[PDB]
Paper text:
Photosystem II (PSII) catalyzes light-induced water oxidation through an Si-state cycle, leading to the generation of di-oxygen, protons and electrons. PSII uses light energy to extract electrons and protons from water molecules, leading to the oxidation of water and the release of di­oxy­gen as a byproduct. This water-oxidation reaction is catalyzed by the oxygen-evolving complex (OEC) of PSII and proceeds through a light-driven, five-step Si-state cycle (i = 0–4) [Fig. 1(a)]. The OEC is dark-stable in the S1 state, with the chemical composition Mn4CaO5. The Mn4CaO5 cluster is embedded inside the protein matrix of PSII and covered by a large area of hydro­philic protein regions in the lumenal side of the thylakoid membrane.
Based on the light illumination conditions determined, we analyzed the PSII structure in the S2 state at 2.4 Å resolution. The flow of the PSII microcrystals was excited by a single flash to advance the S state to S2. We refined the 10 ms light dataset as a mixture model consisting of 70% S2 state and 30% S1 state for the Mn4CaO5 cluster, its nearby residues, the region around QB and the BCT binding site. The OEC structure in the S2 state was in the open-cubane form, in which the right side of the O5 is open, giving rise to the five-coordinate trigonal bipyramidal coordination of Mn1. Upon transition to the S2 state, W665 in the O4 channel becomes highly disordered. This is accompanied by slight shifts of the nearby residues D1–D61 and CP43-E354 toward the position of W665, resulting in a narrowing of the space that has been occupied by W665 [Figs. 3(e) and 5(b)]. The B factor of the QB head was decreased from 123 Å2 in the S1 state to 101 Å2 in the S2 state, and the features of the isomorphous difference Fourier map suggest a shortening of the hydrogen-bond interaction between the head of QB and D1-S264, indicating a tighter binding of the semi­quinone QB − to D1-S264.
Residue numbers in the entry:
A (entry chain D): 11 to 352
B (entry chain C): 23 to 473
C (entry chain E): 4 to 84
D (entry chain I): 1 to 38
E (entry chain A): 11 to 344
F (entry chain V): 1 to 137
Write the structure that this text describes.
């Protein structure tokens, strides 16, 4: 059958400069609106009525301090549709109420779905295995756990990350003070995957570039490679001997090496996502009970664990009134935890 | 287009200056043209500093790095470091600016008009990287030039006005150095000091008699060695230990420059003698000491006995002992008790800070200096907000010492990378595998297995 | 290659620049006037420098109700005199 | 402590000299290709 | 062949299971000293007066720590940057109280790891390789120098060096944020791009090469048996991978040259970590992150807060609480 | 909110006379205060002696009262301790000690008024932020 569906399928899969596909019907509008909404918001839209913050170029912020901030805590987990009961179809109120944040987060989520479908769709057309799409599950797990699940466990969208550079920095510091997130072994595994991934990236690329075969006469060795050549361009045998003698162990299987490079950062991001799902519920790894019992009774007992809780207590008391304005925290000077002199 | 494309020279455009390795005429021009740029910045930056300079603000409140160098040499300044005549500053900048036109003219001529190779032109100006004799001779000439340079500082210190002496009795002044230290026990004793706290290696030199005397030795050493290297050619033990190639010599210099950049970083950070605090602002140690001095003065005026005031930890609130017994300022500045400065030393006795001088001999000019230095601590943000990281906007200040130390640490670091890059490549190119492993001669395939 | 004219082809053609020496500055000026006329303020509800507070007030006009949030903001806006 | 100090001083001087005389002992020739680098 | 010549041929021998070499002659004893002292101190060392205020902090397992809270504690603030070898103490008991072990470990470690970089250069010369793997390792190596040596020098005390422990690392990072606002420093931001980017390109390169493996096995066997160690031919189709990735984005955003692809994989994380180490290294001299505290002001002069001001509130809480008994005067100047 | 003439009206002396500053004077006051005083008085505190701040309540209780233009102008010529008992020109920038505090050398009478006006107007704007220290940052 060559009906309208098949004809349309043909046009959608034309080999053009930007491939479209069926997946492109979802990807391009959602990715474009998520982007445009972030640019619109960081240029023109305030956070005065939701946070008490200026947050756009128009107010005088710079690239580091602009944001599309989350809605006010009184909005709860409202989808904040433009035509919803809060904005009631008013575009200006919608922006002042934080509507751009759900807009970006929701169109962003469906755009990422679209992008992963594009990896499946293009891989099926070209005839490769879909391991690139499988690897992209990790960014999606991070996005979904941090931007959707985390605030859904909390009181409202207000505590989701805001879309901005310094706003994200505040999120890092809030997670230290309130969640003791550095103590969390699921974050630790995430750190190991990201840093080990960076390591693998540098060490593989450095190793290839320094075990090249001399396949040309020029001092610039880039020219001596042909994409259709059948032979390996660097010496696995020499690479393997060098690292065996430098480090003790070495890769010998090139298929294993590259699978391992997929595996390490992907797994780490998945591990960090699980930790954040816990923090949605305040299910923290905040304390070691044995340390607290000893420290409560023995005022000479001190560890870096007890030192860091003092820091967290400072963060909470000093940032909370301005970071959570809907709470109306009034802390007199005399109650603020402070060391000597400072 | 001789060696001006990749096919002919073997080097891509992004390594295009490597095409100059064996083109001594064009390599000469590129070096002369670059020197013109160095001199250009010196003269132009100086004029810019002068134009923006207010004589009655401290130099270190004004973002100055070059005028402080000129002032340390004795020019423009009087007692206390007060600027008395900005015209020396103007002259230095103008003369560097004008000279850069002479260097740029020579650089652009040799680079694009003169002979591309000097060897067919002049056997004196031509050279072979592999000619060990010529290479040590060129090196010999430049060692003699460098030694003259070091003697010029001595000539200025001893015959042409002197140097600014932050330690001069009175509050600091220009002073003719009449008896520079010549005792090689002193001069080379600095070389053998530990670099750790309280010793400080050569960064610890704290008087112009030693500074001037050390440049007399360096001047003679360089001139001696330059004559030695013109008259000699490397010995066999030296011939076997080095690579003898243009890239190799470049890599040795890069290692030397990195080392000097790190030393310079520590010099401007700790030394307040050849970088006077009058001009560069207080060191980090200095401002921290100055805070303790300030509050000891405030509270003593209010009635506190500072010698016996027990602080919260049981250590003295104002005064305590160093690990070897010396009386030192308390609080976290305990780490800085190795600091020495002209405003603090009159309170110092044989056991360190002396309670009786503290009680009776603190002059108002010390209270002023300590408050000034405490409020110009070398702390500030990248957009030049002075103070701790939590300070609010108001004060437009980053210390010259921070600017100079950070800039030169970054430069020194990348010059060490450059050393490794070029020394590794030089080694590989001399041995013949810098382009890759020979497929039909792969070394590892002729070696027994490890297991 | 996928058929479209190469980009280096187009951006070194006289006709491209004939068209875009108008259209690029024209959009730029439209963006300028969007701010310079004050229109951006009113489209997005962003306060001007004299509109964050009332003259004596030091409280944030924070939205505290979900379904009357629109009236809360309109009320806050009236209270600017 | 004094014995410890001399012991370390001796051990360190020992290893540093190996390093220095090591790289002085014809090291550019210790490569698999061209073994004439003087 | 005299004895010195025999020894030199054994040191520089390419047949030793682990290559020794001349850097190895310094590396092996210094790394053993640092490792042995670290293991012993981590298990059994008594509490250390890190900040010089006679307030000892417990770091070892035997004194109440687990793997997460344990540390070798930095040497005392009373020592500053003074050299504190065992023989400068009146007793081992003094040395331990004042945190002697920290100095012994980091000084031996930094020498060993620097010779490790040298050894990477050295074996590559013996095997006829190109020499620049050691240059990639200079980025983690520079970073270790930053938190163990450079930052102490600029702040004047090894007591502000990074502790040798997991929770100790977090203490260092939090106090660093309060005193330098490192998050707002562009060199830490480039470092984050370096390691996020390196992790991205790591998964990418892995997924692309894995996606284009040439069928050489059946469904019941691991595909890794389709590559044989030392085979002459490539094991995946780089034309297929380019043809996929080029359509994912557009054709000219994809690499077709394996050599330049792998160079980019080297360069991106190495350059980024160099900047991160230069961040720590230049904040060591108190050139701190961007300060926009109270940068936005209204028509009357009211402060309009931004996210930078919220960050500052959190930085203040770290500032006022850290080292709670160690400051007597109102400004924390180092 | 904006910088109105009311905000800019401040006490000239102690007998109750006011004076109204222009926005130009106030911004000149801010710049000159940054130049000559903020290294110690940023935000209305006093880094070298935090017990004394520049809050108007504190200045009212100084001897003689410093909570007006004349009192502040006098202070920059001949500063005294809080009780008025001692003259502290030797340790505090002033016109009388312009030779040891050279940044005071190019301050005119009209500059002293503008610096004074800024000190009196700022607390009207910032409230507790002025003289409050880090707690109010
Ligand atoms: C061929 C080379 C082979 C290798 C050789 C290895 C030899 C041993 C290793 C050397 C390094 C030891 C570290 C010393 C740390 C230090 O505390 O250095 C500080 C000292 C300065 O010492 C200070 O010097 C001061 C001197 O000031 C005194 O004198 C002054 C006079 O005005 C003032 O009065 C001042 O107030 C007064 O205190 C005081 O003594 C201080 O207490 C003291 O700490 O710097 C100095 O000695 C000079 C500068 C030292 C070099 C900087 C090292 C940085 C290296 C970075 C590498 C990174 C690469 C990454 C790889 C990838
Ligand atoms: C300090 C910086 C510096 C200097 C001094 C040089 C110098 C040189 N380069 Mg290198 N290069 C540099 C940086 C520098 N380069 C950088 C950053 C790159 C990366 C892009 C390169 C990439 C590169 C490549 C790929 C090549 C060179 C080549 C050269 C040489 C010949 C240039 C030529 O013939 O062009 C002719 C250029 C012109 C005719 C145009 C005008 C050039 C003039 C000199 C500019 C002068 C302007 C100045 C204001 C005039 C003042 C005059 C006044 C004082 C009277 C020359 C010695 C070539 C070479 O090695 O040849 C063997 C070569 O192939 N360079
Ligand atoms: C005196 C110091 C010195 C000298 C004379 C040389 C000379 C050379 N280098 Mg070496 N190098 C050095 C230091 C030096 N290098 C340092 C300190 C490093 C560490 C980063 C290197 C790392 C290095 C590498 C990796 C390579 C070389 C190469 C070369 C050769 C070709 C260079 C070229 O044409 O670049 C052309 C110049 C450019 C393309 C310009 C680069 C632009 C820089 C990165 C911008 C820096 C930003 C700036 C400071 C601030 C921003 C300004 C902006 C706002 C306007 C040539 C022999 C090549 C080689 O091996 O040949 C044998 C090569 O591959 N160098
Ligand atoms: C020795 C180097 C050095 C140092 C320590 C200083 C220090 C200073 N300069 Mg000077 N200056 C320099 C060189 C230097 N400058 C050069 C080369 C120029 C020509 C552009 C100038 C022209 C200049 C002007 C016009 C002015 C200054 C000013 C100042 C002061 C404020 C600086 C500032 O706010 O920067 C802001 C911070 C930055 C710009 C950060 C830059 C980040 C760089 C681009 C990162 C690059 C890293 C590395 C080089 C690249 C490696 C790449 C890798 C791949 C290899 C400060 C004392 C100001 C002043 O107060 O004068 C009275 C001023 O107006 N300088
Ligand atoms: C140090 C860098 C340097 C070097 C090694 C050379 C070398 C050479 N030049 Mg070049 N040149 C240079 C810089 C340099 N020049 C500069 C700065 C200019 C612009 C003024 C020129 C302009 C120039 C021209 C127009 C010509 C040359 C020529 C030559 C060749 C013959 C020179 C000769 O025999 O004169 C004999 C020796 C002298 C006349 C002695 C000169 C003494 C000087 C002028 C007095 C001051 C010296 C003292 C060290 C000053 C220190 C200043 C410094 C600290 C800044 C020779 C290869 C010729 C050539 O290429 O032939 C084809 C040629 O025609 N040069
Ligand atoms: C730009 C400066 C410079 C350079 C690049 C050279 C370069 C050279 N010199 Mg010359 N030399 C110079 C200045 C210079 N010289 C001066 C000023 C003098 C007069 C003092 C001499 C007197 C001289 C003599 C007598 C000899 C040389 C020789 C040589 C050659 C061998 C170098 C070598 O193996 O050193 C390597 C250094 C060593 C082997 C000794 C150092 C021991 C170890 C490495 C410990 C030191 C490291 C430690 C961290 C340093 C810290 C400070 C220290 C003081 C504690 C080489 C071509 C040799 C030659 O072949 O002459 C024809 C030779 O016999 N030079
Ligand atoms: C640090 C070196 C300072 C500079 C620069 C300025 N001031 Fe100051 N000020 C300083 C101190 C230590 C004190 C307390 C003095 C004492 O012992 O009483 C002061 C006091 C004042 C006051 C009085 C505050 C009060 O509540 O009574 C005022 C009004 C004052 N200073 C003003 C002022 C001006 C206008 C300055 C710039 C020209 C200035 N100060 C600079 C420390 C320092
Ligand atoms: C939201 C919304 C929407 C949408 C809209 C849109 C879609 C928009 C778009 C927009 C856009 C689309 C925008 C854009 C912008 C851009 C910009 C603004 C840019 C800038 C840039 C720059 C600035 C650059 C920079 C740089 C870099 C980055 C690097 C290189 C260098 C340089 C520096 C150049 C709608 C209507 C649907 C509905 C409602 C809501
Ligand atoms: C080779 C080459 C190159 C380079 C070049 C160069 C590097 C050059 C330089 C050059 C130079 C280095 C030049 C200089 C010049 C200078 C001048 C031209 C000056 C003038 C001056 C004046 C005119 C002054 C004036 C005045 C006075 C006198 C007084 C005061 C005021 C005033 C300032 C006005 C390149 C890269 C491009 C590439 C190609 C090749
Ligand atoms: C001026 C002055 C002074 C003086 C100074 C002096 C006198 C100096 C000297 C200096 C010196 C006199 C230095 C030296 C140096 C040296 C070096 C730095 C060396 C190095 C070496 C090397 C690098 C080698 C290497 C090797 C080996 C080891 C093995 C074999 C191979 C080779 C060769 C590679 C004083 C301080 C008083 C004061 C201030 C001023
Ligand atoms: C504080 C550091 C002091 C360093 C002092 C340096 C002074 C330099 C004087 C020359 C010393 C070099 O002495 C060096 O020793 C050994 C013998 O032990 C020699 O013997 C060497 O010969 C060849 C050199 O290609 C090697 O293959 C061989 O393995 C080795 O035995 C070196 O050829 C000689 O150059
Ligand atoms: C959504 C997918 C629904 C397919 S619907 C399908 O489309 C054909 C044209 O291609 C027609 O010929 C056919 O009658 C119709 O049922
Ligand atoms: C290299 C350019 C030299 C230009 C001339 C510099 C003279 S320098 C001159 O020398 C005098 C002694 O006679 C000093 O009294 C005076 O302070 C000093 O500036
Ligand atoms: O020691 Mn560790 O931490 Ca660098 O600030 Mn100061 O000191 Mn202490 O206080 Mn904050
Ligand atoms: Ca010679
Ligand atoms: Cl702490
Ligand atoms: Cl303190």
């Amino acid at each position: 059958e060559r009906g309208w569906f098949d004809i349309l399928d043909d046009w959608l899969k034309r080999d053009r400069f930007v491939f479209v596909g069926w997946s492109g019907i979802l990807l391009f509008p959602c990715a474009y609106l998520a982007l445009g909404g972030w640019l619109t918001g960081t240029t023109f839209v305030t956070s005065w009525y939701t946070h008490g913050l200026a947050s756009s170029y128009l107010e005088g912020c710079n690239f580091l301090t602009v944001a599309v901030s989350t809605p006010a805590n009184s909005m709860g987990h409202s989808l904040l549709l433009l035509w919803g009961p809060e904005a009631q179809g008013d575009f200006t109120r919608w922006c002042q109420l934080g509507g751009l944040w759900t807009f970006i987060a929701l169109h962003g989520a469906f755009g990422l779905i679209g992008f992963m479908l594009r990896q499946f769709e293009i891989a099926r057309l070209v005839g490769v295995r879909p391991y690139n799409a499988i690897a992209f599950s990790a960014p999606i797990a991070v996005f979904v756990s941090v931007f959707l699940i985390y605030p859904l466990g909390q009181s409202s969208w207000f505590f989701a990350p805001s879309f901005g550079v310094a706003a994200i920095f505040r999120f890092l510091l809030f997670f230290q003070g309130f969640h003791n997130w550095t103590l969390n072994p699921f974050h630790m595994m995430g750190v190991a995957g990201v840093l080990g991934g960076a390591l693998l990236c540098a060490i593989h690329g450095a190793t290839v570039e320094n075990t090249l075969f001399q396949d040309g006469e020029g001092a610039s060795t880039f020219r001596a490679f042909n994409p259709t050549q059948a032979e390996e361009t660097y010496s696995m045998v020499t690479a393997n001997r060098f690292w065996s003698q430098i480090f003790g162990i070495a890769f010998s299987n090139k298929r294993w090496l590259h699978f391992f490079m997929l595996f390490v950062p992907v797994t780490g991001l998945w591990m960090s996502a699980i930790g954040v799902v816990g923090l949605a519920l305040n299910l923290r790894s905040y304390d070691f009970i044995s340390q607290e019992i000893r420290a409560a009774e023995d005022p000479e007992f001190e560890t870096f664990y007890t030192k860091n809780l003092l820091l967290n207590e400072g963060i909470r008391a000093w940032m909370a009134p301005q970071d959570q304005p809907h709470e109306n925290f009034v802390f007199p000077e005399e109650v603020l935890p402070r060391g000597n002199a400072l | 287009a001789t060696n001006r494309d990749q096919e002919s020279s073997g080097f891509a455009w992004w390594a295009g200056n490597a095409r100059l390795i064996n083109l001594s005429g064009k390599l000469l021009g590129a070096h002369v043209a670059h020197a013109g740029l160095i001199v250009f910045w010196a003269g132009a930056m100086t004029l810019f500093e002068l134009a923006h300079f207010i004589p009655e603000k401290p130099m270190y409140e004004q973002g100055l790095i070059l005028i402080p160098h000129i002032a340390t040499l004795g020019w423009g300044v009087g007692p206390g470091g007060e600027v008395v005549d900005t015209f020396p500053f103007f002259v230095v900048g103008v003369v560097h600016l004008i000279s850069s036109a002479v260097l740029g003219f020579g650089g652009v001529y040799h680079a694009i008009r003169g002979p591309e190779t000097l060897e067919e032109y002049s056997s004196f100006f031509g050279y072979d990287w592999k000619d060990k004799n010529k290479m040590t001779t060129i090196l010999g000439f430049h060692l003699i030039v460098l030694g003259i340079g070091a003697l010029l500082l001595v000539a200025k210190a001893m015959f042409f006005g002197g140097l600014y002496d932050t330690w001069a009795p009175g509050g600091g002044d220009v002073r003719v150095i009449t008896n520079p230290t010549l005792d090689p026990r002193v001069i080379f004793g600095y070389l053998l000091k530990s670099p750790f706290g309280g010793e400080g290696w050569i960064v610890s030199v704290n008087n112009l008699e030693d500074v001037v005397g050390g440049h007399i030795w360096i001047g003679l050493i360089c001139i001696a060695g330059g004559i030695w290297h013109i008259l000699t050619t490397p010995f066999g033990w030296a011939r076997r230990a080095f690579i003898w190639s243009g890239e190799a010599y470049l890599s040795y210099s890069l290692g030397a420059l990195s080392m000097m950049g790190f030393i310079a970083t520590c010099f401007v950070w700790f030394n307040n003698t050849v970088y006077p605090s009058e001009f560069y602002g207080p060191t980090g140690p200095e401002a921290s000491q100055a805070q303790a001095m300030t509050f000891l003065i405030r509270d003593q005026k209010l009635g506190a006995n500072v010698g016996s005031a027990q602080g919260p930890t049981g250590l003295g609130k104002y005064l305590m002992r160093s690990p070897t017994g010396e009386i030192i300022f308390g609080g976290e500045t305990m780490r800085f008790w190795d600091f020495r400065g002209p405003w603090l030393e009159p309170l110092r006795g044989p056991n360190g800070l002396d309670l009786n001088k503290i009680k009776n001999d603190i002059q108002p000019w010390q209270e002023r200096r300590a408050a000034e230095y405490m409020t110009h601590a070398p702390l500030g943000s990248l957009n030049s907000v002075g103070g701790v990281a939590t300070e609010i906007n108001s004060v437009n200040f980053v210390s010259p010492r921070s600017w100079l130390a950070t800039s030169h640490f970054v430069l020194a670091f990348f010059f060490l990378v450059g050393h490794l890059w070029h020394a590794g490549r030089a080694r590989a190119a001399a041995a013949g595998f810098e382009k890759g492993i020979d497929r039909e001669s792969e070394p590892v395939l002729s070696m027994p297995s490890l297991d | 290659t996928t058929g479209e004219r190469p980009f280096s082809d187009i951006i070194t053609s006289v006709r491209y620049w004939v068209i875009h020496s108008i259209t690029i500055p024209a959009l730029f000026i439209a963006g300028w006037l969007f701010v310079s006329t004050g229109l951006a303020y009113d489209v997005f509800g962003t306060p001007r420098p004299d509109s964050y507070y009332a003259q004596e007030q030091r409280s944030i006009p924070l939205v505290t109700d979900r379904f009357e949030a629109k009236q809360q903001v309109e009320t806050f806006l009236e209270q600017l005199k | 402590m004094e014995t410890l100090k001399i012991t370390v001083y001796i051990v360190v001087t020992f290893f540093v000299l190996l390093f220095v005389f090591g790289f002085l002992s014809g090291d550019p020739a210790r490569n698999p290709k061209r073994k004439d680098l003087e | 062949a005299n004895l010195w010549e025999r020894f030199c041929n054994w040191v520089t021998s390419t047949d030793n299971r682990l290559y020794v070499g001349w850097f190895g002659v310094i590396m092996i004893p210094t790394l053993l000293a640092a490792t042995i002292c670290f293991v012993i101190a981590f298990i059994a060392a008594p509490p250390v007066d890190i900040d010089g205020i006679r307030e000892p902090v417990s770091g070892s397992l035997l004194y109440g720590n687990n793997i997460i809270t344990g540390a070798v504690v930095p040497s005392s603030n009373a020592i500053g940057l003074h050299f504190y070898p065992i023989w400068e103490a009146a007793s081992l008991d003094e040395w331990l109280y004042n945190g002697g072990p920290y100095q012994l470990i980091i000084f031996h470690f930094l020498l060993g790891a620097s010779c490790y970089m040298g050894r990477q250069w050295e074996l590559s010369y013996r095997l006829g390789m190109r020499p620049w793997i050691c240059v990639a390792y200079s980025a983690p190596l520079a970073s270790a120098f930053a938190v163990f040596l450079i930052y102490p020098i600029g702040q004047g005390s090894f007591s502000d060096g990074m502790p040798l422990g997991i929770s100790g690392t977090f203490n260092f990072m939090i106090v660093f944020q309060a005193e330098h606002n490192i998050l707002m420093h562009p060199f830490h931001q480039l470092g984050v791009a370096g390691v996020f980017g390196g992790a991205l390109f790591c998964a990418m390169h892995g997924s692309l090469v894995t996606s284009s493996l040439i069928r050489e096995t059946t469904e019941t066997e691991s595909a890794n048996y389709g590559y044989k160690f030392g085979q002459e031919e490539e094991t995946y189709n780089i034309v297929a991978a380019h043809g996929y990735f080029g359509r994912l984005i557009f054709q000219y955003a994809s690499f077709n040259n394996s050599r330049s692809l792998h160079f980019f994989l080297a360069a991106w994380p190495v350059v980024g970590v160099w900047f991160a180490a230069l961040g720590i290294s230049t904040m060591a001299f108190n050139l701190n992150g961007f300060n926009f505290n109270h940068s936005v002001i209204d028509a009357k002069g009211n402060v309009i807060n931004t996210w930078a001001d919220i960050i500052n509130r959190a930085n203040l809480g770290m500032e006022v609480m850290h080292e709670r008994n160690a400051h007597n005067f109102p400004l924390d100047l180092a | 909110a904006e910088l109105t003439p009311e905000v800019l009206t401040v006490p000239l002396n102690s007998e109750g006379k006011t004076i109204t500053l222009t926005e130009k004077q106030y911004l000149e006051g801010k710049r000159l205060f940054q130049y000559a005083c903020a290294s110690c008085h940023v935000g209305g505190i006093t880094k070298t002696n935090p017990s004394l701040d520049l809050r108007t309540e504190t200045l009212a209780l100084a001897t003689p009262p410093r909570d007006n233009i004349e009192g502040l102008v006098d202070y920059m010529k001949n500063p005294t301790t809080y009780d008025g008992e001692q003259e502290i020109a030797e340790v505090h920038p002033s016109l009388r000690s312009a030779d040891i505090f050279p940044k005071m050398r190019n301050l005119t009478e009209k500059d002293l008024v503008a610096i004074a006006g800024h000190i009196l107007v700022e607390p009207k704007i910032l409230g507790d932020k002025w003289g409050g220290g880090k707690v109010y940052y």
